[PDB]
Chain A
Amino acid sequence: LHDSLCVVRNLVKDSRVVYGGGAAEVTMSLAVSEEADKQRGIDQYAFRGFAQALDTIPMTLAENSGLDPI
């Protein structure tokens, strides 16, 4: 409940709602990735790191169900 409740005071503290199912996470893999190509330097691989990263939420989310993370 302290979850269900707090979730609502999240809406009170800052009204807005994204989309779950790792969906919110997936966006970064795309968006952030583009802002790395046109970034050049060494911050292209570091930022590409946030592509390598957010992929976990959907991966474990889905793998925890038995579906192929790939």
Chain B
Amino acid sequence: EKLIDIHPQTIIEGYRLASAAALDALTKAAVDNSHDKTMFREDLIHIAKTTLSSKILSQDKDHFAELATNAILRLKGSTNLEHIQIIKILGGKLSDSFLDEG
């Protein structure tokens, strides 16, 4: 908007080409690996954690990050997230939310 004070339809050219350079560099800085199921689980938790944070349930962040990384493990890659159903019941307290293998 501020820049528009200057044709607009060209501004799109920049934001699609310049933020493409950004899109590129961000791939460079990326860190791949490992691919050992030994290491994976330790990363997936770190991801689930960083995501599960800032959400009412952050209190026992681990408790949930574990819930997630598990259900994801079953069914290799990449499978639909439609077989693992999140059922919920109104039961006293928080953290009584376990993951079920049945």
A interface residues, Cβ below 8 angstroms from B: 59, 68-70
The distance from the CB of A29 to the nearest CB of chain B, in whole angstroms, is 15
B interface residues, Cβ below 8 angstroms from A: 5-6
Q: Which residue of A lies closest to B7 (CB)?
A: A68
Considering the chains assembled together, what is the distance between the CA atoms of A69 and B5 in angstroms? Answer: 7
The distance from the CB of A59 to the nearest CB of chain B, in whole angstroms, is 7
Q: Contacts of A69 on B, CB cut-off 8 Å?
A: 5-6
Q: Contacts of A59 on B, CB cut-off 8 Å?
A: 5
Considering the chains assembled together, what is the distance between the CA atoms of A68 and B5 in angstroms? Answer: 10
Considering the chains assembled together, what is the distance between the CA atoms of A68 and B4 in angstroms? Answer: 11
Considering the chains assembled together, what is the distance between the CA atoms of A70 and B4 in angstroms? Answer: 10
Considering the chains assembled together, what is the distance between the CA atoms of A61 and B6 in angstroms? Answer: 14
Q: Contacts of A68 on B, CB cut-off 8 Å?
A: 6
Considering the chains assembled together, what is the distance between the CA atoms of A59 and B3 in angstroms? Answer: 12
Q: Which residue of B lies closest to A52 (CB)?
A: B2
Q: Contacts of A70 on B, CB cut-off 8 Å?
A: 6
Considering the chains assembled together, what is the distance between the CA atoms of A61 and B19 in angstroms? Answer: 32
Considering the chains assembled together, what is the distance between the CA atoms of A70 and B6 in angstroms? Answer: 7
Q: Contacts of B5 on A, CB cut-off 8 Å?
A: 59, 69
